[PDB]
Amino acid sequence: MQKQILTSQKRNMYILSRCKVLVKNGQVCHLHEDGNVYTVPYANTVFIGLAEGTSITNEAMSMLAANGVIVFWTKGGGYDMFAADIICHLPQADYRPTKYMQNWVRLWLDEEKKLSAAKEILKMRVDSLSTHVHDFGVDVENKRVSSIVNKFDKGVTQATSFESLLGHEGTFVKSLYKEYALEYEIEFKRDHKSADNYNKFLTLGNYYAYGIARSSLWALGIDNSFPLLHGSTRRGGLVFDVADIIKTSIILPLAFHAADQGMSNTEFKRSCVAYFDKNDILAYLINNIKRLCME
Amino acid sequence: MQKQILTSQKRNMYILSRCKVLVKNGQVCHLHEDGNVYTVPYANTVFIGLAEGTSITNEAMSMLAANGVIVFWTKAADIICHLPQADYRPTKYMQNWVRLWLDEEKKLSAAKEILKMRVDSLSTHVHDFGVDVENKRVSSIVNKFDKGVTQATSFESLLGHEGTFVKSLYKEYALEYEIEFKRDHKSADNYNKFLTLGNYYAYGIARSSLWALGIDNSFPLLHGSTRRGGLVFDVADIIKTSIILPLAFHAADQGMSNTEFKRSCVAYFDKNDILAYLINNIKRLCMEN
Amino acid sequence: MQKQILTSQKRNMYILSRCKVLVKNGQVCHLHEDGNVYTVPYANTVFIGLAEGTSITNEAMSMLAANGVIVFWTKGGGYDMFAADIICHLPQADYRPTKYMQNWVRLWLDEEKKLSAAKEILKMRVDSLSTHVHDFGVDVENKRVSSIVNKFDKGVTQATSFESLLGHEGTFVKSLYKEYALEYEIEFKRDHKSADNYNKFLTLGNYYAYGIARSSLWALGIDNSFPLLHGSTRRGGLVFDVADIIKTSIILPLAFHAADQGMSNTEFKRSCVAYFDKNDILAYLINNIKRLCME
Amino acid sequence: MQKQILTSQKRNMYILSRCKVLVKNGQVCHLHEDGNVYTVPYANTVFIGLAEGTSITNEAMSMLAANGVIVFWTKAADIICHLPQADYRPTKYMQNWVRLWLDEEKKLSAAKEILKMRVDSLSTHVHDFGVDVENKRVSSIVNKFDKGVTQATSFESLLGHEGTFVKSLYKEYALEYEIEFKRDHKSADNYNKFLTLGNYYAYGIARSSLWALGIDNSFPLLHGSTRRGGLVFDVADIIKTSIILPLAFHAADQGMSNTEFKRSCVAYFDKNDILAYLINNIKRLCMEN
Amino acid sequence: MFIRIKCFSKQPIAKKVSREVSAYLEYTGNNTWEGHISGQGVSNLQTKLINVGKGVKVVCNYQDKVLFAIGNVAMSDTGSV
Amino acid sequence: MFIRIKCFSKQPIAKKVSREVSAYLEYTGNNTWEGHISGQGVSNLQTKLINVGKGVKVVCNYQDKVLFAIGNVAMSDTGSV
DNA sequence: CAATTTAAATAGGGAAG
DNA sequence: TTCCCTATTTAAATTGC
């Protein structure tokens, strides 16, 4: 079924599940496998995504790209993309990198603004932990959690170098892993190659975190290779640098409580897309990158 | 495990028309309107540039984008190409690409290199007969394109620099090989429909040079009124003036069909490693820093 | 089945048809398609011929090359040659040339006894007509046949030019065709391009007589490339020379009777082969060449 | 029907072991394995030689010997061949060759002109390796035997004088390719087996150079007491000691099986057109007057 | 000249094109004939496969070439089926 | 670089070989894949052909010379069955 | 020597998810 | 797409010749 997901102010990102897409009566429509045909709105829709089970005709492609809709392709749930043209201001008359690209490369090429943007994205990591509250896992308002939050805030506000910020992020992730592990009372140590259910579940949640991060950066049309925390040679470091907002506050409690129950990966995917829609986190990352770029 | 060939190691291509790029036993098959399925070489395809009547399946789009074969729509002002995005591209090349696009003095040099790569494709891909490659009528047009792209004072200055080169090449090919077809998109014949499914094949070897090696189509080398379409159209114009229009003119002069022109374009891109040249040429300008 | 042909003094040309020749108990034997194996004599054999269905092996060929025989392949009737080895003095001790072209092209490289050999070979064409008789068709002892023998004897004797010889041969061919045609109460002229039964039986008989030429020259080591009457550029002119000894004598009434009584081509080949084996025509051609050779 | 494609551009050559050569569906064949029937291209086949446990029936012979394709047999030594005869081969070559060949001075001249052609066989075919074109020993020995056939006192003076050449090239190629094998027809090692099976390539090329152009072989050159077989070994040894001996020492040195050795000589025949060379090479001796 | 015949026709006409191209080439993969040949032999094949009768479907490939293509049911554009 | 793959295997292994090689070469007819792969591409194609396992019947061809061959029953000088 | 069978045998199809 | 037909093209084998 079709899904509405907020980007900035209107539900302009459409997720189109199992169907066939074609031109009907001189306008772009789509036909599900149950026999029900739906058209599209055009002023409502700016972004249209396609999931497993779809095919779009070229006439519909040209009519969508003719007067101001940009199509994209994605995995199941709409929160990991693999094929997309990249965003312009108006996709027909002009072709240039966006003003989000413009202010983002201004803050990337300015070293003081580079460090200020790094401090601000860790400050939004603070605000993501303080904002996204969950009934499971640790409580963000207790003594230990908020003490580690205050220690991180002192760490970012008193740091100058990039490696100091990386060390603060490192003790943040090990500390948060320790208290989340203490919440369900099993000892853990982080390693990517651990083939247990808990670590593979956390890497799956991390995968959908980089998917929602990539959908956020494509939603502003900004690329994937201008990181703030990781180095310039890190493979897709900007995707991790926007995803670690969500790994430390959303992916860790969801994946950790769901692998406490140990249910299936496909239903975890469905629940992750459901929480991504209900919390409306993609628009929160657009709000984050908009307040970084506009300063 | 399964390291796979790079986009600089992919030589097959396709510009499918009246097709249906579906999933057939894991192979991305472009099933045309006759009733047969052309199994495209998905890992070795630069692209599968769709035309009118083509429906690209979602799992087929997944197998195309995962193997770095960025499908595109051809039917240029409005030609949207779905570049591959899940497989993360070269971050060292892409980070220095914006640093060579945001600085206007560096953006001018990057645009000059990306538009003078067309002169480097008429001398590397030397499979051009009839109008030759040193006949001083097509080589003169390539030299004039290089002279126009050498300055490249702004992205809006030489925005339509490839358009004049394509017009000169299409005029010289017709004046040499006994024709009078001009630059048109709806002049239905064996000539103007040859360099409209041949330039789509030139965008076939351009969407694999910006989905694995190069940065993106958003930051283009040419921007302006007559520079709409993206940097894929600025990577196709390197191969359009050397491997698309000369093959189309040779097929029109020899009386070949559109399918023979498509096979000639795919074989000339495979033998000269034109897709590999585009993939290793985008990395030269991007990863120069 | 083994079928014999005499060449000089002893019956030695065994023809094998439809058999598997292989090594039985360290000796060359042939297993026919009926299931019976028969051996081949060795000291009685210098030529050995393989008709259709005949397969020989390599160890058998090794013994046959080790102890003194020459083997050849042959077509229908076991007589028409297509694939052969060649005749030497002795294939094991010294591989020296057979003396028949020694005598013959010694007498050919000088013009005078070359012309003597030409008039002698038209003399044995005359002897082929006068010697060999049939129970049907034109009797060789009537007034017209004896008249054209006397005219041809005169026309061979006085002349010294080969143009007169080939004109006499063409006059003989046309005249004998006219008398053979009026014996069968029809009017006819020879044409290779006509596809009637009479002309095609003549052409098939001419091809089979070309076969008797090539076989009788292979039995002495003389080769098919050395004409006496036709020119040096004519391919296989010696074959058309030696066949013209018989093409007016035995092939002509057999083919004319086969065309008159209307049998098929294969049984006409069988009747020609029966006449060739019963009245030792190959051996008479060997005797002809041997008296033309030693002078 | 057809022009019956000329033997000087025939392009295949075969030795078979443990088979039953026959016609299946109008096609002369192999039976190398138990049920593995192959196909012989009689319009490209130079020759079919047959090892132990082999046989060819008459339908294969009649289909085969219609355009100049021989059969000889393996078990140097005594070999009876089968040249095509029903095809009336051109006469001028053999007329002029018997015209020289009766006269023992002109027969000696024919022997000295076909025996000097070892150097020509090493001259038009140069792509070798190891000892290559010259190891400063093979050029010397072929030069002294070129002078030895340049003198040419009598036929029985050179009856086994070429045998010294073949044995000195057997023990000249072995001082650099390390083995101490000797000439034996029953030795089970790789060197003798390969160098014996290559004589059955040389014999086929020689007898098919004689079958098509016109010479019936057994009227011999280099006759005597040891060189048994006729003019075929006077033409087979042209490519034996110059062409098949280096490839035989290669294949016995690298130590691969017989089939890929035969592939190497098939390719060396095909890319250099060696029976083409042997057709217009003896025509310069036959047609010469 | 190494040329390469690939036939696509049927059951009965494939036997005749087998008998008239394996005379000139050598069968390797399932229908893929290959082998060394002359251009005079190429013209001879073109003659005897005009004279084979209607219903043949054969394309020759001398390396990367489309030298003669007699008969066609469906070739899927750029060098495929 | 111009290589050519023929598959002689049996089902369902032949469909797997079709999936592996059809990602790298376009299909011509009766199992003779044909086209252009770089040498590292042929090397990793050999690697996934090894990772297919037993039962693979593939002979490659670089012009006339066999570039590689994985799995065989009988393949003489000619290459016929 | 080709006269034809029988299948070894694949995309080519429908579903499906 | 994995999957299962399922018409097919297809051989090489039979098999006279």
Report angle CA B206, B212, B215 to the nearest 5 degrees.
80
List of chain F residues whose C-beta atoms are within 8 Å of the C-beta of residue B40: 26
Q: How far, CA to CA in Å, does D100 sit from each of C109, D266, D277?
A: 11, 34, 22
CATH number, domain with residue A274: 1.20.120.920
CB contact under 8 A, D33 and F80: no
Residue C90 within a domain = no
Please, how many CA atoms are within 13 Å of residue B10, restricted to the half-sphere of its CB? 34
Q: For residue F45, what is the nearest residue in chain B, using CA coordinates?
A: B4
Same domain, D59 and D123: no
Smallest Cα–Cα separation from B109: which of B158, B46, B45?
B158
Give nucleotides in strand H with any atom < 7 A to a protein C-beta: 1-2, 9-13
Chain D interface, best mutation among C28, C56, C239, by max D CB count within 10 A = C56
Comparing alpha-carbon positions, the chain E residue that sits nearest to D267 is E36
- Residue B82 in any domain: the answer is no
| Alpha-carbon distances, residue A122 vs A134, A146, A209, A253, B60 (angstroms) | 20, 15, 17, 19, 39
A89 in any annotated domain:
no
Residues 6+ apart with CB under 8 A from A138: A144, A145, A179, A180, A183, A253
Q: Best mutation site among F25, F38, F45, F46 for testing chain B: the one with the most B CBs within 10 Å? A: F38
Residue B11 lies inside a defined structural domain of this protein: yes
Residue type for B273, please?
D
The resolution in angstroms reads 3.4
Q: How far is F80 from chain D (nearest CA, A)?
A: 5
**Are E78 and B37 within 8 A, CB to CB?**
no
Chains B and C touch (3+ CB pairs under 8 A): no
**Would you state the torsion angle of the CA atoms of residues A264, A267, A268, A273, taken in this order, to the nearest 10 degrees?**
170
- Tell whether C172 is covered by a domain: yes
Q: Is the C-beta of residue B153 closer than 7 Å to nucleic acid chain G?
A: no
Encoded tokens for C56: 């020989």
At residue D93's C-alpha, the angle toward residues D90 and D97, to 5°, is 145
Chains that touch B (3 or more CB pairs under 8 A): A, E, F
Q: Note whether D155 and D22 are same-domain residues.
A: no
- The minimal CB distance from F8 to the residues E6, E29, E80 is found for E29
Q: Are residues A78 and A184 in the same domain?
A: no
Judge whether D82 lies within some domain: no
Class of the domain covering E2-70: alpha beta
Instruction: Indicate which technique resolved this structure.
Output: cryo-EM
Looking at the complex, report in whole angstroms how far the Cα of residue A35 sits from the nearest Cα belonging to chain B: 19
In chain F, residues with a C-beta closer than 8 Å to the C-beta of B12 are 25-26, 35-36
Q: Using CA of residue C168, residue C174, residue C175, residue C180, what is the dihedral sign?
A: positive
Are D179 and D50 in the same domain? no
Is the same domain home to D66 and D107?
Answer: no
Q: What stretches of B161-289 show up as alpha helix (H) in DSSP? A: 161-176, 199-202, 232-239, 245-253, 258-271, 274-286
B103 and B50 both lie in a single domain: no
Report residue B40 as tokens: 């495209």
Burial of D99-138, coded b for 16+ CB within 10 Å and e otherwise, reads ebbbeeeebbebbbbbbbbbeebbeebeebeebeeeeeeb
Inter-chain contact B12–F25, Cβ cutoff 8 Å? Answer: yes
**Distance of C1' in G17 from CA in A53, Å:** 8
Residue F53, min C-alpha distance to chain E (Å)? 21
Give CA–CA dist A52/A289, Å, rounded: 29
A 10 A CB-CB count for C196 gives 11
Binary contact (E79, F28; C-beta < 8 A): yes
- Helix H or strand E encompassing D237: helix D232-239
> Alpha-carbon distance D125 to D241, whole Å?
13
Residues whose beta carbon sits under 7 Å from strand H: B 23, 25-26, 59, 62-63; D 24, 35-37; E 7-11, 14-15, 18, 27, 30-31; F 19, 29-30, 81
Neighbours of chain C (3+ CB pairs under 8 A): D
Q: Which residues of F fall within a CB distance of 8 Å from B15?
A: none
Helix (H, G, I), strand (E, B) or coil at C144: helix
Domains of chain F by residue range: 2-70
Indicate whether B56 and B97 sit together in one domain: no
**Do the domain assignments include residue C94?**
no
CA distance B158 to A138: 59
CATH at C75: 3.100.10.20
Q: 3-state SS string over B40-102?
A: CCCCCEEEEEECCCCCEEHHHHHHHHHCCCCCEECCCCCCCECEECCCCCCHHHHHHHHHHHH
Name the minimum distance, in Å, from the CA of C266 to any CA of chain D.
18
Q: What range defines the domain where residue D25 resides?
A: 7-73
Backbone torsions φ then ψ of E23, nearest 5 degrees = -65, -30
Distance between CA atoms of residues A259 and A265, nearest Å: 10
Q: Say whether both B61 and B108 belong to one domain.
A: no
Alpha-carbon span A157 to A173, nearest angstrom: 18
Q: Which of E4, E27, E30, E38 would best serve as a mutation to test chain D binding (most D beta carbons within 10 A)? A: E38
Is the CB of B12 less than 8 angstroms away from the CB of F38? no
Q: What are phi and psi of C291, to 5 degrees?
A: -80, -20
Radius of gyration of chain B (CA): 18
Number of domains in chain B: 2
Is there a single domain that holds both residue C71 and residue C104? no
E36, closest residue in chain D (CA to CA): D11
Verify that C160 and C244 share a domain, yes or no: yes
Q: Residues C111, C253: one domain?
A: yes
Q: Which chain E positions have a beta carbon within 8 Å of D27's beta carbon?
A: 18-19, 22-23
A132 and A228, same domain (yes or no): yes
- Max Cα-Cα span within chain C: 63
CB-facing half-sphere around the CA of A175: CA atoms within 13 A: 15
Q: Is B51 part of any domain?
A: yes
Nearest CA in chain F to B14: F26
User: Last residue of a domain, which of A41, A60, A84?
Assistant: A84
